[PDB]
Curated annotation (Swiss-Prot):
Keyword Acetylation annotated: yes
The name this protein goes by in its record: Endoplasmic reticulum chaperone BiP
EC number: 3.6.4.10
Modification sites for Phosphothreonine: 490
Amino acid sequence: TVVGIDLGTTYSCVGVFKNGRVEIIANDQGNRITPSYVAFTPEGERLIGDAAKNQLTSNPENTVFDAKRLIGRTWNDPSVQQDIKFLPFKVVEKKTKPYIQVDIGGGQTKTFAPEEISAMVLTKMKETAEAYLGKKVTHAVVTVPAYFNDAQRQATKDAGTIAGLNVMRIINEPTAAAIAYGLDKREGEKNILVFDLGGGAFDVSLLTIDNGVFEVVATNGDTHLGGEDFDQRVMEHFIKLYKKKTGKDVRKDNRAVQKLRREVEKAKRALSSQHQARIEIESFFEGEDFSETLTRAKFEELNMDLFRSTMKPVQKVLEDSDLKKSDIDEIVLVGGSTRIPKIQQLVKEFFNGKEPSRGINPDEAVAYGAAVQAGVLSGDQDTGDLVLLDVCPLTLGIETVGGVMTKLIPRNTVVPTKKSQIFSTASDNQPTVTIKVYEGERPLTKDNHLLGTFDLTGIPPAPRGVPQIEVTFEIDVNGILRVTAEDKGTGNKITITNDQNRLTPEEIERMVNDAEKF
């Protein structure tokens, strides 16, 4: 049986379509969502989920969380370096990637790719499903943010493979939410706006939904804007406050910083229903206590620039779809951070008083949609009708003379899609031709994201400009790029190498074996 897993920054959730409906499956603690946490105890035990989160404050250096904020990123990504300040576990550079180093008991050190941490979370979600179903689960639909780039998508797929899952399809989070909203609606064509603000990433998608036919018209997001940033802002406010009042800098004491995290999380939840919240930490720093009152007004003030920045993607989506505010028939809110009253207010005010759709749990709707998609792709006939057209989030381009972004496949193109182009050589007997592919909307490549450098190899000796190599760039239904090449001369095998440093089957096998040790 194929399950849907929402692999989230802060929490994950697993559902299954069985007997004509979705079941969101409760974990072994009775909880319908599971924290995306992995911890290693002094005695060498690996904890995952609720048990891992519960011991954050006593064992912070060896409690791992927020791996989705690192997955598929390079070491020098400013999102990675900015987040290190608030993470208690050591982040170290390996293979141009941020790896996670922990102590596994007995003074023994171990380093993990973010993929491996996410694989452990996926394994726990798989196990939750296997307990409920009473049998092995080998196939899953796994979620990603709509605005995830090529590397982030592939890395999430690799996490699934490490966890023993054949990833049937990766599904964009707002699209899954739209399926939860729209399945079995028979209203004809409606324009649906999904506003998806979770623990770590933000997406906006505009879909048309028409009697089982779902199409993403436009999407735009920010893969490093979410609940964890709102917590960070408040954490940093109190770290600086303590330094001003006492002279003491607590930024390197991991117990102090993560005890503050724990209190900020509780406070943020309370402030969605109350107007004040108490922060209280007994052994904060060097024996001394820490007590502060956080008002809703102050919480909103500290984050207002981030909150107001959520309207930037909304306007980008309206522009690309050529729709006005009044053309939006339904607003679907998903992700835990859409519970924040000020977020709800800003969205309502942007759309001139329009209330969001009712009957949608923002913590569960994504998993619900993923579970439906899994059922449909399996060959179920008791599921509602589902035809899905989804898009690539980023314009793909090639770097040309002067550092210019020459567009190849535009943003918001329905996938799968491909584009071909003929390449030749610049010098006599040149054996290799290098192509640099970028992701983004700016005119110069220095202001976009490098996807990869691809080398056409084994070009046979000939005078400059004679070889004719057709290179095909295909984005698959998961949103992942494949680059291939064919010789179109009058008469060789052209192999392509790249600098993506992708996890090989050998490397994945080693990671599977390492995880069996616990």
